A paper describes a structure:
Here, we present the three-dimensional structures of BoGH31, BoGH43A, BoGH43B and BoGH3B, expanding our knowledge of the structural determinants required for xyloglucan degradation.
There are two GH43 family members represented in the B. ovatus xyloglucan PUL: BoGH43A and BoGH43B. Both enzymes have demonstrable activity on l-Araf-α-PNP, though BoGH43A was considerably more active, and both are thought to be responsible for the removal of pendant arabinofuranoside side chains from solanaceous xyloglucan substrates, thereby converting S to X for further processing by the α-xylosidase and other members of the PUL. Crystals of BoGH43A were obtained by hanging drop vapour diffusion (19°C) using 0.1 M Tris pH 7.2–7.8, 0.18 M magnesium chloride and 12% (w/v) PEG-6000 as mother liquor and were used for subsequent structure determination. GH43 members typically contain three highly conserved acidic residues in their active sites to impart activity. Together with Asp34 as the general base, which activates water to attack the anomeric carbon, Glu189 is ideally poised as the general acid, while Asp140 completes the triplet of residues and is important for modulating the pKa and orienting the general acid for catalysis. The positions of these residues are absolutely conserved with other GH43 members.
Residue numbers in the entry: 19 to 522
Write the structure that this text describes.
């Protein structure tokens, strides 16, 4: 196919996209905040269909997430390719700030961090004439310097080059050179409903820069975007097509009733007209749509998330994520190919890493389920599935060990000072329990199946887990977890599979 695609191109929690072209291959990275591994890494041949090939930050030495939460950890990343080397540059705001890692093979383990001198966030690199130029946004000014990207040494003084058109929170700077102009693209307006992309240019990389009279080049903040199901379009990165066409990846989100979003900021694609000696124009009127009826590069489908993920390979795919730095020894694979989680007393509301491993929710309408076999449990030990936004904002569905060798299914909502037990239901002595979470745009629905019978446990509003309600920079994840109620506990839980099916 050479025509038409659906947005978002990477659904669910995938913000701040940056992309690079390496020959006929495209590589893309997203911000990941408090989650480990960090900086998911995607590959495409057409900019539409993406396979997650790994993550850039896969080892604790690359990624200290001590006390990280949805408002901290890893912020926007940028990926670049130059002279056979890939660079990923980002900020760990919970740690030592701006750094990069590099590799000659994106599928391998990337380097240890190279810490950088210039401050602010949203660092980016541009290469020319054997030089490596870094931009970032300290004190709201886009600053430029030259660096040695292998040693981290700053080679020239930082220079303030632009501070945008006047909008709030000037960020996400990237430099491109085209038609003898240095173009400087940024985000303004904040990453909520006022998000916009603006652009300026200069004959000199160090300015002065003049803004495009047509700014902003992409936004749904104005009348033209007010009725769109997509809002908050911004944080773009321009990339060339294999046929000489132009494109941008950007973040946005899909709004829900009352102006909420729970799937995070996702990655979207837009075509760009960029004639010789002209300013770029994004999809004719600076808006994007869910159904994009436009010409594309020759399309090639990629592997996606299985509807039934099993653990027979004794490894988790790159899609799975933990909270902060996990205790690796508490995640093992059994001889018969189940995922075994080892209990600790850390709850999902402790602001520390629990025994917890999750997949991003990627559809409004979905069903997820897993069988749970809780073993060697003391009273009040529990294991199950959590619909998780933040340590103070999550819905937990679980099997619990009770006194006198009894067990129950519980449903608990954590919302700030509320911990609400919606249901506590006695289970039969025998029978494997499958826990089930469904959703539509309005509600999560909870249930369980045992001895061939499915039981409804009730429903809860989606809005209380939104970014607007809960705060932060992330989306809902669906996590398998286990928590013990004693230190003395030897409890563990086996999960034979994880099912996830989204409606397109």
């Amino acid at each position: 196919h050479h025509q038409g695609y659906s947005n978002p191109v990477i659904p669910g929690f995938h913000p701040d996209p940056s992309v690079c072209k390496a020959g006929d291959d495209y590589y893309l990275v997203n911000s990941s905040f408090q989650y480990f591994p960090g900086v998911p890494l995607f590959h495409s041949k057409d900019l539409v269909h993406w396979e997650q090939i790994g993550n850039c930050l896969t080892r604790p030495s690359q990624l200290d997430l001590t006390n990280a939460n949805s408002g901290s950890g890893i912020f926007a990343p940028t990926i670049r390719y130059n002279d056979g080397v890939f660079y990923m540059i980002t900020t760990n705001v919970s740690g030592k700030g701006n750094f990069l890692v590099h590799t000659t093979d994106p599928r391998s383990e990337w380097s240890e961090p190279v810490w950088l001198e210039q401050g602010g966030i949203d660092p980016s690199l541009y290469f020319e004439d054997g030089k490596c130029f870094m931009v970032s946004n300290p004190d709201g000014y886009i600053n430029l310097c030259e660096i040695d990207p292998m040693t981290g040494k700053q080679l020239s003084s930082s220079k303030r080059i632009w501070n945008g058109t006047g909008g709030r929170y000037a960020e996400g700077p990237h430099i491109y050179k085209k038609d003898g102009w240095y173009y400087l693209l940024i985000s303004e307006g904040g990453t909520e409903l006022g998000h916009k992309v603006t652009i300026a240019r200069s004959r000199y990389i160090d300015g002065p820069y003049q803004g495009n009279p047509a700014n902003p080049i992409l936004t749904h903040a104005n009348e033209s975007g007010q009725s769109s199901p997509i809002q908050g379009t911004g944080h773009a990165d321009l990339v060339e097509g294999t046929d000489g066409s132009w494109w941008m990846v950007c973040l946005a989100y899909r709004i829900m009733p009352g102006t909420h979003h729970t799937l995070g900021r996702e990655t979207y694609l837009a075509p760009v007209r960029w004639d010789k000696d002209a300013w770029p124009v994004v999809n004719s009127n600076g808006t994007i749509s869910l159904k994009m009826d436009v010409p594309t590069l020759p399309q090639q489908e990629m592997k996606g998330r299985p509807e039934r993920i099993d653990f027979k390979e004794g490894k988790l795919s790159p899609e799975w994520i933990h909270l902060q730095n996990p205790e690796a020894k508490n995640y093992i694979f059994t001889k018969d190919g189940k995922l075994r989680l080892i209990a600790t007393p850390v709850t999902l509301s402790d602001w520390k890493s629990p025994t917890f491993v999750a997949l991003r929710q990627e559809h409004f309408d979905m069903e997820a389920s897993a069988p749970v076999v809780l073993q060697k449990a003391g009273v009040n030990d529990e294991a199950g599935i959590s619909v998780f936004m933040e340590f103070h904002s999550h819905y937990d569905l679980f099997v619990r060990q009770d006194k006198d060798r009894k067990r129950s299914v519980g449903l608990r909502y954590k919302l700030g000072e509320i911990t609400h037990y919606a249901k506590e239901v006695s289970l039969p002595t025998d029978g494997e329990v499958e826990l089930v979470v469904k959703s539509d745009i309005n509600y999560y629905y909870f249930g369980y199946k045992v001895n061939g019978i499915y039981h409804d446990l009730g429903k809860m509003n989606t809005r209380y887990l939104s970014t607007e309600t809960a705060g932060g920079f992330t989306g809902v994840v669906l996590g398998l977890y286990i928590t013990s109620a004693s230190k003395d506990s030897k409890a563990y839980a086996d999960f034979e599979y994880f099912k996830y099916k989204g409606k397109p």
